[PDB]
Amino acid sequence: VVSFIGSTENDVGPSQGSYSSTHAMDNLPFVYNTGYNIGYQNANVWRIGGGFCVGLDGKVDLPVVGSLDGQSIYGLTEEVGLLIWMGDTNYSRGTAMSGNSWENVFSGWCVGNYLSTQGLSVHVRPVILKRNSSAQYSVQKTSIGSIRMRPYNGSSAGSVQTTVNFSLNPFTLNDT
Numbered sequence: 001v002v003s004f005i006g007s008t009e010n011d012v013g014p015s016q017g018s019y020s021s022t023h024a025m026d027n028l029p030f031v032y033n034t035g036y037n038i039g040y041q042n043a044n045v046w047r048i049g050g051g052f053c054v055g056l057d058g059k060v061d062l063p064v065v066g067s068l069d070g071q072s073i074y075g076l077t078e079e080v081g082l083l084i085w086m087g088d089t090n091y092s093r094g095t096a097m098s099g100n101s102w103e104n105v106f107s108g109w110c111v112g113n114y115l116s117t118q119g120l121s122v123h124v125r126p127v128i129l130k131r132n133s134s135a136q137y138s139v140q141k142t143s144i145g146s147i148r149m150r151p152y153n154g155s156s157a158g159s160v161q162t163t164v165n166f167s168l169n170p171f172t173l174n175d176t
């Protein structure tokens, strides 16, 4: 079966992270490719065992202000939005998020007759929407959304906690 073993509120990105870019923000919107640097990752959010089957759904609560290659650009301020990925523990397995409804972000797996864990990951990349004369862009603490576990194939959470939340740590972007 399954148990919750992670934290309910989770911060994405390092407190007061500084993200600079040498590319020219020539055409907007401009994506800051900060890789997986602005993220949260935890291999052990639920413990599971004995044929248990679980995937992950994700939801972004930020307003959609556009899209980039079919993925929603979620707005933070008039100047800065975000591309968002949520999914299984590995950052590389992140699912690009669109819209504001619950979306399947990890197809899932079944644990055999052993005990193991289900984890998750969230990462984002800043997007320059509107220019700033200072060439510096600031964002304060902000709620992003949530991820929940999805028991399937008979399995069920029961009264176990299903959902965790994510907050963006404030950061500053330097247009270098």
Ligand SMILES: CC(=O)N[C@H]1[C@H](O[C@H]2[C@@H](O)[C@H](O)[C@@H](CO)O[C@H]2O)O[C@H](CO)[C@@H](O)[C@@H]1O
Binding pocket: 042, 043, 044, 088, 089, 109, 116, 117, 118, 119, 120
């Ligand atoms: C890696 C970890 O600590 N937990 C993973 C989990 O991994 C399992 C199993 O799937 C994997 O085959 C073996 C290594 O060969 O390790 C076990 O512990 O896999 C799930 C789904 O990918 C992750 O959510 C979890 O973080």
Ligand code: NI
Binding pocket: 023
């Ligand atoms: Ni380039």
